[PDB]
DNA sequence: TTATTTGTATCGATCACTATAAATTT
DNA sequence: AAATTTATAGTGATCGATACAAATAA
């Protein structure tokens, strides 16, 4: 394919952008900040990502596949729905309090409110939080078939509860609540299990 | 001198609504001045700056949607019932359509530019006060007798604060009130 | 040559904000 | 006439985004 070769690694630039979105949220991540962290100039970013909303949408998918695969892994890899939900919440808290990533979950922190211009992005993360509930719900559905959860168990109710705790754990992580306290928060939420 | 053509507490109410919906950085001076129905020079004469306007809208908001919290916790005869009543009333407010859904303190500024770090830090301190409300009501339950003396109060207060903050995210996502009330009943099953 | 990426250097719109002076009081 | 608030019309800075042409390939 003809053309001057690309001088930057696309995946790296995508990763460095998702880090900026993770800390500053979608609207607070300015083009000056994105091009600096990515170590590229604006027209390069627009040639590769089309627009800031397109950059965020690619950054979001990158985040989900690199910081969201562990969710299904520990969920499906558990012998019961309870221990799967337990292990996911413990892994999530350890990740939320790691010295190697921004604190909390991008999906929760990046765009809760904002200008009406960015409503598509907010609806996107909204949809992605509905997936967090659906993820818990699917695992519980397997718990019913395996026998570790009761047949009449209201899966939506129970999934929605642990997604509430999970979303709340992003705010507490952002507020720098110590890891020991959040793991105890997880243990207390597990007491609510049927 | 000349009289002012707006009412300060009313303009503060409209600024609060815009901040509630669009967040601190998302609320432009254009959108604020249109809501309050004042022009920019009147805004800065009365509030100093956008940051000062937000701080006054925050104090205003806490006066309405913050005082009822300690009132509900102390009005109940036990810590458990107090936490329950507060969570139940919060869900109702989070899903009634006079207020925007969910709490301003959780939604207004969780991330943003480095220039707004002070506003974000002020909202975090306010979330720490929610934790402090539960803990203080739990201290009374230990003294009154409805809560065991060796209860880990800080873990229990943080647990219900985590539920509280999560309910804002779910309220913003338009989760129905019935589903949120079930979350509250489910969180009460974790009571010691 | 033709494609494509690159850095420079902007663009118009909007950001938070304010100089200024007319309008409305005492 | 003095005190004060108001509306008009902007400020310089930054926003997301792009025109342009030198640079680098097929």
From TrEMBL, chain A:
Please give the superkingdom of this protein's source: Bacteria
One GO MF term: DNA binding
Q: Which Pfam families match?
A: TetR_C_13, TetR_N
List the InterPro entries hit by this protein, alphabetically.
Answer: Homeodomain-like_sf, HTH_TetR, Tet_transcr_reg_TetR-rel_C_sf, TetR_C
Keywords for this protein: DNA-binding, Transcription, Transcription regulation
Q: Could you confirm whether the keyword Transmembrane appears in this record?
A: no
Identify this protein by name. Putative transcriptional regulator
Which organism does this record belong to? Pseudomonas aeruginosa (strain UCBPP-PA14)
The top of its lineage is: Bacteria, Pseudomonadati, Pseudomonadota, Gammaproteobacteria, Pseudomonadales
UniProtKB/TrEMBL annotation, chain B:
Q: Which UniProt keywords apply?
A: DNA-binding, Transcription, Transcription regulation
Q: Which SUPFAM superfamilies match?
A: Homeodomain-like, Tetracyclin repressor-like, C-terminal domain
Occurrences of domain HTH tetR-type (ranges): 5-65
Q: Does the keyword Cell membrane apply?
A: no
Mention one GO molecular function. DNA binding
Keyword check for Transcription regulation, yes or no: yes
The feature table lists the DNA-binding region at: 28-47
Question: How is this protein named in the record?
Answer: Putative transcriptional regulator
Q: Which organism is it from?
A: Pseudomonas aeruginosa (strain UCBPP-PA14)
Read off the lineage from the record. Bacteria, Pseudomonadati, Pseudomonadota, Gammaproteobacteria, Pseudomonadales
């Amino acid at each position: 394919t003809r053309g001057r070769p690309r001088a930057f690694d696309r995946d790296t630039a995508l990763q460095r952008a998702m880090d900026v979105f993770w800390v500053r949220g979608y609207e607070g991540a300015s083009l000056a900040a994105l091009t600096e962290a990515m170590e590229i100039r604006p027209p390069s970013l627009y040639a590769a990502f089309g627009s800031k909303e397109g950059l965020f949408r690619e950054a979001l998918a990158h985040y989900l596949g690199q910081h969201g695969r562990y969710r299904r892994d520990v969920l499906d890899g558990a012998p019961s729905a309870r221990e799967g939900v337990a292990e996911l919440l413990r892994e999530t808290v350890a990740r939320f309090t790691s010295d190697e990533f921004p604190r909390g979950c991008l999906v929760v922190l990046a765009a809760l409110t904002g200008t009406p211009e960015s409503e598509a992005v907010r609806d996107a993360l909204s949809a992605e939080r509905g997936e967090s509930i659906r993820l818990f719900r699917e695992r519980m559905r397997r718990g019913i078939a395996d026998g570790d959860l009761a047949a009449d168990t209201d899966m939506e109710e129970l999934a929605t509860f642990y997604a509430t705790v999970l979303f709340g754990l992003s705010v507490q992580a952002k507020d720098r609540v110590p890891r020991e306290r959040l793991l105890a928060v997880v243990e207390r939420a597990l007491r609510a299990w049927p």
